[PDB]
Subunit: 387 residues, 4 copies
């Protein structure tokens, strides 16, 4: 039982091999499956788990009514084994939460679950299931976090939280956590940037996060930092815009791209020097489809050329959030940190005529062997009996 | 594998961080969730479990009919992991019981489950799931116990049991138990006192219990004792009255407060010198709302002044029983015993137009970091299909 | 990990403390609970399990139709933790079977499951879940076994099987089994005796079985034997008759009591020298009620006097099969083998107007501390939705 | 924790003892049971598991509609303990797949799950749940594999895959896999042969596979090979034809038997010198009944004589796929590899008037002790509520 080192580089990847699919919404038509959104995957040295925010209700029951609503006292962070449906009969209780993050340092699970009122929310940090720290809203305006895994390097785990407007300048802080206790934090000095829902991973002892600008950017902002929280900030420069909504691909910017910049979706990308692996929706205007694109100069260069595209979900099918996750060498036995990703397939409101909103999930792992594009969509037939 | 020492003091706490919420009644609208009441939490050195008294029936099924009834041969003590719904598919069987207690000494679980007729009930003690002792009613009038966790100190666990009227003078005994065997007991000499449903915890090698006077007290009675069962008794002196029902706050007493004193609700409080942390309903007349109040002189002083109030459940929402539980240093790695508490959110009869009565639960742990008041209510929409 | 010794004597017991209740039929009204009959309890050095014969169907589903029928290719022997309902979601698969036995030698589980046609049935023996032996019908007329636990002493386990008529002279064999392999067997020379459904236990290195005479006895036959299968046979002499049906209590016999002797119910008794602890129905004519009676001279003496009766299930409530089980000192830490028992509470056909037949269960352990009589019946309201 | 040697011979068997029956379809009428087909069994040194291809849907739910369809993005490989129903509450997620294989090398599980489009499908290999390799379609025409267990010998596991037409000459490759990585492969040079759905087992350090000719053979093709993938090929010569459909028994061939040769069913056989144990349907024209036949010269001789037949499923009852599985000496403690087999009992479309297709399963292990013929059919009553 040993701390993850986090000191090897990301593995080189040519393509993405399908890892899991839970079919949660299809199964929940009959079975006892939680209404969920904001799922994410995180791994220990022994296993991979799906974390998710329940709505304290099951699919196809009357208590799923009104689950478009983001924040309530009923929402809880729970987890289950990867690829299994999230049920009351197979899910571990983690925290009371309407925003969350989680990660394993090699020894125990850290979970961060935020609840409370919009004007004074509190993040509750747990290590091995025991409360180890709290942090309260510092701008009194919806303290919130990643909705994907935190990142760990040599016994320290790292996350980003936001507090303030979702449609204007807000406040962004980076945290270093050891055994569930906050040991350091810093406010990012990012005037004119907007960071929401960061997808962070370790690479060569440093953390890279690719986030959502909900204010005025259709490209994604990034922040990277070392273990002392010395950071750098920027936006992905590629004209292959990564947010949803966005414009058609054209010449990009290393600052926020204003065209179609308001609103957004949680997402991710993996940096390889000047290059980038971008996961994005297929539709420029809606949460539909998903694809992976390799742009060899897209981290720093503004053209809209790219070299590989792999289809994940077809343009006519519902998608949603996505996030990164990694598998450390302590799990895989490889000599590098393996990049992986998950996609939330959102069903229900606002786009479909149901009383509820819920998601299923798919995930993929990066490989250098042969792969293929396809579409692996949610597959449920809506509406349901309850609607 | 080592016995809990129980020799450190209670941790100092400024406020309460949310720890769990099971949403049992919401989920049970569709899922297979036991009808339960009298839930409580207790921890080992490895995990925290919810114990509860089933009615041998599931929510939204005809066998939930008439579950306002307290004692039957169908009620069982069972347990599940904290925060999970109590289902037949995730719950461990403990004992046949219509009143119960349980606690872990560091090595194994002790459960105490009382069943049989009102005029001759028998407590069955189990250690590691094996029957180790029994004790039979000594006044032939509903032998009954805590409905929350027993308290353990250096291999010995301690509980309190009552036998006799619920509306006049009864008989109260303290027990010391080792490996599931009663090794000592004493009858408390408490004329004019009434003790029901004690919430007991360890603090510096001694046990303190805060209980319910169902006869003629709207403040709570207490009993404290050492390992040889040498005890002291009194009532909480604060004019911040702890029971439900109760009068509006005014000058208190350190005997039983007769105004609104008949009837009651199980509750708890934590003593810190002359001060007290009081958990109570918000309503003076019904089991609605919940709040935590820090009164720095409330154990021994009679004024109705207090320094901190933290909201837990809104005044218009259903609450119910509450109890203490602790997390020992052997679980947390701290240097003190961490006080925590649970609240039962009772749904159905007598206050709502259903055929059934059941509860869900919430819990909190004491911290010295930032916290916030809110309302985390049950959230089910009654009546149900079966009603 | 060590073989059970089986060499200490049965513990002296004054009365019976309630150990489990599963409420299976009440829960199965909504939940996913197997239709079962012929349940029984057996323990390892670490835990106690409920074994049972499913009908390959769930309660309140159409496939429960016709489950009065004893033998089919759908019946399977499965097991779950004691006191939990038998569900597809918590039950371990053991064997394909319409008659069964099971026991733990201290190292692994032995299961014996008989299936096949009436004219050529085969017992499949499994040790640690792996097929270790078979034995085929030797009279071609419903090879059948205990429906309760086998008995183990120093690495050998022992059982009894019958083949031939249920209403006349049949053939009875005793088996010694080591690591799932039959190492010895003998045919009992018992002209004019009838043995069905033996309840066997260890006591001081020897096995005692108390069985059902379905031909012409309203008292119970017994067989006892050592590890070399040197046996003795008799009938319980007490005028406190043990079978169902039976006459009113009167002077008994050490041979089969012909009055009301045909038909029967599986049951048990525990021998203490000349004395006996008898479990029986309360009704002389029907499977209703249950009671424990201590008759200090009832093993060898024919009077109808007895000294203790303890009520278990009221005379107006449904009962059914019962059987012995033991808890070895390797489990309990005691210096003797603890006698325990279980009762099957049969619901449905033939006595009630349902399409199905199923049972729930209760169990008790022998103690020398205080106990009480009561009634702990099944408690389901019949008929069900499906009927 | 040690690799399976795989160097002992197959155990001699006189007959087949029933090992498991899951009753999945019966139970799924009410319970939450996956729609599945292509089940198979495989064992580790500690346990036996059922693997299966879900349709991402539950029985008696609308999403079971159209499950006659073989390949979709919703199908997943999952596994549960042998004999238990495949539910979302007891099943481990393995891979996204519409064709699969799995096997344990003594240390960890290998799973192979093929998904993607018909013209470019990709097999994802996982070792201990971690992606270790991929292989992509080489003829762009439904890359596909065994639907039963792979075979392991001294740390290397072996499988066969087909790519190309199901009704004419296709391409067949053998693979050697170590810790989930392909280390060797070879294309079989088998003009005029057709290999689908191979049932492979180890015997004396070499692998033998018995497969389905879907093009023009009513007898079964075989391939056998050593660890360096040096192979031999032929067809089972017995006039006791093994496929379904097939002609009535008559003089056979050791090439493909053209009469009734098109189409087929997955099956198996076990070679013992010149002899063979053949599992087959009872019907020559449809997937009904099942029987085991010992033909002492049937591997290499063409007559239609045989020595032993054991009934498994009656001629009027539904059967389906069948496959081999083995129990190694490391699991059993025997000195030889124990042959066992499973049968899929297919319910629904095309033969029955439902919207869905699913199966249940039975399994048997080879013994030299007494056995018996019977019928252990599926037993569900179709149609269901949803139909
Ligand atoms: C939960 O429990 C409640 C309480 O038992 C139950 O509600 C009751 O349902 C029964 C059956 O519908 C009702 O009983 C009837 O009452 C009427 C008068 O109101 C009588 O006329 C009926 O008696 C006639 O019918 C019987 C059978 O045919 C005859 O035996 C009898 O002699 C009469 O001819 C019968 O007593 C009862 O009124 C209600 N009570 C209330 C308060 O609603 C409820 O249905 C249960 N729910 C579930 C889901 O279990
Ligand atoms: C399982 O799948 C089957 C196959 O899809 C499904 O059975 C089908 O149900 C649908 C809906 O009831 C039927 O479709 C209708 O067919 C009639 C003629 O028979 C048409 O007139 C209907 O079209 C009208 O209505 C539509 C909606 O209002 C309009 O969009 C349309 O333009 C028309 O006005 C409609 O197409 C279909 O006939 C059956 N098919 C069969 C073979 O039974 C079944 O219900 C599914 N079951 C479950 C549980 O999912
Ligand atoms: C409050 C800002 C935040 C990020 C833009 O909105 C999120 C957007 C969401 C969305 O765009 O789907 C759903 C999230 N559950 C919500 N987060 C919270 C904490 O309410
Ligand atoms: C019998 C006295 C006792 C304490 C006042 O009543 C309790 C009150 C209850 C209550 O006030 O809600 C419910 C408890 N289940 C009941 N206890 C038992 C054993 O019946
Ligand atoms: C076949 C004789 C046997 C013992 C008398 O009948 C049993 C009686 C039964 C009974 O009296 O309830 C139910 C048992 N399931 C049945 N056993 C079998 C194997 O069918
Ligand atoms: C595609 C050829 C293949 C072997 C003949 O067809 C199989 C026949 C089937 C069958 O005959 O029942 C069902 C299998 N699920 C299918 N395999 C796939 C991958 O689709
Ligand atoms: C990474 O950390 C490991 C584990 O402590 C260390 O042994 C090794 O030198 C480092 N790897 C590099 C520099 O690639
Ligand atoms: C959904 O909730 C709203 C608000 O309480 C209510 O008015 C409506 O009837 C509900 N609908 C259903 C179908 O449950
Ligand atoms: C990792 O942290 C430990 C603290 O246990 C520290 O002593 C060590 O130097 C760190 N290692 C690296 C490679 O930074
Ligand atoms: C508490 O008990 C521990 C464990 O035995 C002991 O080592 C320690 O001295 C005790 N401390 C006090 C202050 O009693
Ligand atoms: C019982 O067997 C034990 C275990 O081997 C042995 O040590 C002991 O002598 C025996 N007990 C008796 C005779 O009571
Ligand atoms: C019970 O089974 C019989 C025999 O198949 C059948 O005729 C009857 O309709 C069934 N009844 C129900 C209610 O399922
Ligand atoms: C128990 O059986 C063993 C076989 O391992 C034998 O050698 C030993 O003598 C037996 N002990 C008793 C007490 O009979
Ligand atoms: C089989 O392999 C085992 C395990 O390595 C070895 O000890 C044994 O000699 C082998 N036997 C034969 C006959 O190859
Ligand atoms: Ca944006
Ligand atoms: Ca570019
Ligand atoms: Ca009171
Ligand atoms: Ca005060
Ligand atoms: Ca259900
Ligand atoms: Ca009889
Ligand atoms: Ca007598
Ligand atoms: Ca063919
Ligand atoms: Ca032949």
């Amino acid at each position: 039982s040993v701390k993850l080192a986090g000191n090897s580089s990301l593995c080189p990847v040519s393509g993405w091999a399908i890892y899991s699919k839970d079919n949660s919404v299809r199964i929940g038509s009959k079975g006892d499956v939680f209404v969920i959104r904001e799922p994410f995957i995180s791994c220990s040295p022994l296993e991979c788990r799906t974390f998710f925010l329940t709505q304290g209700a099951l699919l196809n029951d009357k208590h799923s009514n009104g689950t478009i609503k983001d924040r309530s006292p009923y929402r809880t962070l729970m987890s289950c084994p990867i690829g299994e449906v999230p049920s009351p009969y197979n899910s571990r209780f983690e925290s009371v939460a309407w925003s969350a993050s989680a990660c394993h340092d090699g020894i125990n699970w850290l979970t961060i679950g935020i609840s409370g009122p919009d004007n004074g929310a509190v993040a509750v940090l747990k290590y091995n299931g025991i409360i180890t720290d709290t942090i309260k809203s510092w701008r009194n305006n919806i303290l919130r976090t990643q909705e994907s895994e935190c990142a760990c390097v040599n016994g320290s785990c790292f996350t980003v939280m936001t507090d303030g407007p979702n449609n204007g300048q807000a406040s962004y802080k980076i945290f270093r956590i050891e055994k569930g206790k906050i040991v350091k934090s810093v406010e990012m000095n990012a005037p004119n940037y907007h960071y929401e829902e960061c997808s962070c991973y370790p690479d060569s002892s440093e953390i890279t996060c690719v986030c959502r600008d909900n204010w005025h950017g259709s490209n994604r902002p990034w922040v990277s930092f070392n273990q002392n929280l010395e950071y750098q900030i920027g936006y992905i420069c590629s004209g292959i815009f990564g947010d949803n909504p966005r414009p058609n691909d054209k010449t990009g910017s290393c600052g926020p791209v204003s065209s179609n910049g308001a609103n957004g979706v949680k997402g991710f990308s993996f940096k390889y020097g000047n290059g980038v692996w971008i996961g994005r929706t297929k539709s420029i205007s809606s949460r539909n489809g998903f694809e992976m694109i390799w742009d060899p100069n897209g981290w720093t260069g503004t053209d809209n050329n790219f070299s590989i595209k792999q289809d994940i979900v077809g343009i006519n099918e519902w998608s949603g959030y996505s996030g990164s996750f990694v598998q450390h060498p302590e799990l895989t036995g490889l000599d590098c940190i393996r990049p992986c990703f998950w996609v939330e397939l959102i069903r229900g409101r606002p786009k479909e005529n149901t009383i509820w909103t819920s998601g299923s999930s798919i995930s993929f792992c990066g490989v250098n062997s042969d792969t293929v594009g396809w579409s692996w969509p949610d597959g449920a037939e809506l509406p349901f009996t309850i609607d």
